Design a protein around this ligand. Sequence first.
Ligand SMILES: *C(=O)[C@@H](NC(=O)[C@H](N)c1ccccc1)[C@@H]1N[C@@H](C(=O)O)C(C)(C)S1
Length: 268
Amino acid sequence: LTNLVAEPFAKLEQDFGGSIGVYAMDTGSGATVSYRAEERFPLCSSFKGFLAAAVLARSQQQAGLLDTPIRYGKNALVPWSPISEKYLTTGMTVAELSAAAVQYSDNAAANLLLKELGGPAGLTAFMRSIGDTTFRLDRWQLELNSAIPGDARDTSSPRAVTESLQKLTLGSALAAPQRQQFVDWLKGNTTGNHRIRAAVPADWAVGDKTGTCGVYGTANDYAVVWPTGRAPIVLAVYTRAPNKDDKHSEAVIAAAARLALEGLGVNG
Ligand SMILES: *C(=O)[C@@H](NC(=O)[C@H](N)c1ccccc1)[C@@H]1N[C@@H](C(=O)O)C(C)(C)S1
C-alpha cells in the first residue's frame, strides 16, 4: 500500500536545489506515501512538539505539574522567545511554557522545559519509551540548529516522526485527556500557515509543528489533518540542502504536502 500512485517529488527537490523527505499515512486504510522517508534530517525546532508530549506524559504521574509556576532570569532568554520575554518579570506555568514552545516556537520556553525533563537524553528516552528508535536529541537551543551535512545529532526521519506523531495524537501513547491537550496545542500553532496548512482546505481541522534551522536550506513541518468524512492523515515534510547559505522554502513544503495528499487520493 506504499506509493500506489507515483508523484513528482524528484522534480520538486531538484527545483529547490536540495533534498525533500516525506512520509504520509492514511490512518483509515493504512496506505502511505513515502519519499526519502528513512533518511535523517535535522529536527530544528520541530522537537518541541514531542517535548510537549513528554511533559504531558509526566503530568499523568504528577497531577500538579502543568500548574507549576516557573521563574527565570534574563540569562534564560534565547533569540526568538516572543512569549517568554513578556513574562520575564512574572514567570509562566509549565502548561504556558508548553503552549508557547508549540504555538510560537518560543526558544527559551523550550530550553526551560528540556531542563525539567532531564535534557536531550531525557526527551530521547521518552521517544524510546513509545517505540521510536530513530529520534535523537543531543544538544540545546540554539546549538541543535547547526544542520551540518552528514551529522546525525539532533535528527530523525520523516517516517519515525509520522509514526510517533500518530501514536501520541491518535493512538494510546498518552491518556485520553493528555492526548486531546496535545492535539489542542498543535491545532493552535501560529507559525505554520505557509507550510502543510497551505495545502489543507480551510474547512478541515489541522494541527502542526514547524522547524527552521536557518542554515543549509533546512526546515520542516509535521501535522495531523482531519478531512471531513474520512479518517485522519498524519504526515511529515523535511528539507535540507548542500550549502550553508542555501535558503529554505516554505512553498516547497506546502507543495510536497499537496503531492502527499494527492498520492493518498484525498481530494483537497
Ligand atoms: C526552531 O527551528 C527555531 N529556529 C530558529 O531559532 C532559527 N534561528 C531561525 C530561523 C529562521 C528565522 C528565525 C529563526 C524557531 N522555530 C522556527 C519555526 O518553527 O519555523 C521559527 C522560525 C519560528 S524560530
